[PDB]
Nucleic acid binder design. Structure first.
Ligand code: NA
Ligand code: NA
Ligand code: NA
Lengths: 254, 249, 255
DNA sequence: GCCGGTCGACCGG
DNA sequence: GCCGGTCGACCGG
DNA sequence: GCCGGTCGACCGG
């Protein structure tokens, strides 16, 4: 992680920050420009490393004028896994140009990208409302994570990228929201066999950053293989539980 | 529908109206509610607004048990009730606020009949996938409660689509669509399991040819739900298991 | 490949070359970029006449030099390869009435367009697509024909004898004639056989764009055949199931 | 030319 | 301490 | 995405 080395500084700068409330306080809509606040800070203390996912792509393509077309542009990633996780559509990659750059995309894997010496850190910011105790938020697609681990193995890319999370806690205070806490955690540091997969909630992994464990002490290849086992096991578990919950109780009506 | 009769009045006040740019379409939902609250004052209610009034019109009714009785309907209670603790802890000093998962955005009630209005905003500047409409699971339970309690003329679930786009420093509505759930072919509703088990469709394209009974609608959907759930149990193996069974070992 | 070492020239001679619009009519089927194929042959012969035949043309030469060989048996035995037989031999009645006064002709269903051999055979098949429109992958070759080819390859063990390559010639309308703007070369036995798509409805044909065809297969030619069959069989079973769920159930309500 | 995955973040009738 | 639906609305490595 | 349907005509261990 490029952020961890200076986390204590981010936590310090965030605690106390305020943001004008939408004037609902729930939902992706009433999210938190707190992530914009994180970006602004990472852009200041790590300007040569901080990139919005769409910002990195625009940059990558800008320094390759001779390379045109999606085919030629995809090879620019020089990594099948990073291509899977960062890339944009075919027509979008084909139609890219100086007067038609990439913009924010709702389903982009990462909020902030940090690159240094061919090493990428996919950071995803999670904002939480402390005023209440809610369910763990969506972290990342368990299915997308499964494909990632599959591609890591097939390509032997166990030393290239990390997927980290930064949780920023806030509470209402008058006519604005105020940050009260923060917490950092790396995905590949937790126990892969203990990640809860909420199938209904877009097959998303879920947990509050402040609770995640960081005791995994094996290699990255083992983490991937272990995750895939847990993923396949849970997929079969869901397939069976769906019948007992969405079929059995409704057969009497047919 | 209590809105169908004035759909053109709602559309006329929406199309062309601009709002200062900063969900992003929320501003248009407030315009609908405000309109209804001024043209159907005695029928328009925010879901949480209805609950407070209901509880406020019966102060001598304390406790979750007695309060849950106030709905006089199992199906409606399932669709509108908040929570046991929330229902118990309710008070004139601790009212019900809006909740992200409330079934409806707007409630129109009259003659003991309820209309659950859910309005969907859409950025016409993009050609996206069909949005989430309503949980297929929540619909199934609802249909089950309709059968067990024989409530086929109590409520309707309708959707209003508000199309908008960014124009300069403002947002502007460009078109509107209306449709009724119980008027579409239940066996045709697409159920996106991964997407919160929600049924998805563009209000604009939603068919309205159904001419059967409300009971037949309920039974039909339930059959469609079960079958799809079974089919999904198979799809999961062929997509989330079979292709990864070569890494486990 | 024999033309591969000379692909640069071809790619350069083709691009820019133009041909009038086929009878000023439609631009599909056999009548569209057919003349281009001729242009490719006009070069592969004017620079490699030592080993460039147009399918039937070779067959005409395979004979003649064997007058004592007539009517089935001997004539069918001429091909010391059961595989090359299945991919180049004409009909029985056709390989009977052969003579100097009745030479073979170009047949619409011939496997290869141009044949280059030098013991080792290269079955070249040209492809042309209107780049002025995003279209579907064209029919490459018969999946069934390829399956029989692989089987026969294993049986008599001939994992070294012939190659199946394709040459793409992209063209676009320009005035009263069509012009080439690009070219793409690829070799069938160099891609992932388990990846090849089989369109059963489209004549059980393998479909893909020469330009996008991969060329990185790890293994011998033998491993390919083994691999393909495993793939072709699977798809066939899948097709059998798909048919019932699309051409049977959907209309079972009308009977 | 049909089909469906992803991001965001919420409590318990 | 553990389990898991619901709303919103997005295009094609 | 991935996935696949059409029009035009041809002869045969
Ligand atoms: Na995420
Ligand atoms: Na809804
Ligand atoms: Na062919």
């Amino acid at each position: 992680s490029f952020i961890k080395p200076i986390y204590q500084d981010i936590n310090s700068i965030l605690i106390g920050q305020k943001v004008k409330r939408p004037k609902t306080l729930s939902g992706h809509a009433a999210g938190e420009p707190f992530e914009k606040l994180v970006y602004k800070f990472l852009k200041e203390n790590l300007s040569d490393l901080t990139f919005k996912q769409y910002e990195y792509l625009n940059d990558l393509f800008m320094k390759n004028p001779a390379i045109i077309g999606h085919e030629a542009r995809y090879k620019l990633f020089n990594s099948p896994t990073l291509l899977f996780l960062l890339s944009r559509g075919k027509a979008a990659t084909e139609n890219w140009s100086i007067e038609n750059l990439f913009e924010e995309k709702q389903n982009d894997t990462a909020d902030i990208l940090l690159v240094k010496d061919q090493f990428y850190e996919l950071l995803d910011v999670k904002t939480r409302n402390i005023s209440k105790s809610a369910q763990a938020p969506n972290i990342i697609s368990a299915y997308k994570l499964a494909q990632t681990c599959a591609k890591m193995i097939d390509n032997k890319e166990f030393d290239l990228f990390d997927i980290n999370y930064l949780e920023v806690d806030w509470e209402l205070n008058g006519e604005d929201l105020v940050c009260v806490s923060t917490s950092f955690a790396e995905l590949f540091k937790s126990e892969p066999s203990e990640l809860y997969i909420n199938w209904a909630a877009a097959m998303q992994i879920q947990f509050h950053v402040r609770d995640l464990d960081q005791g995994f002490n094996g290699t990255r290849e083992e983490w991937a293989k272990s995750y895939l086992k847990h993923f396949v096991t849970q997929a079969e578990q869901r397939a069976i539980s769906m019948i007992d919950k969405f079929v059995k109780p409704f057969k009497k009506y047919i």
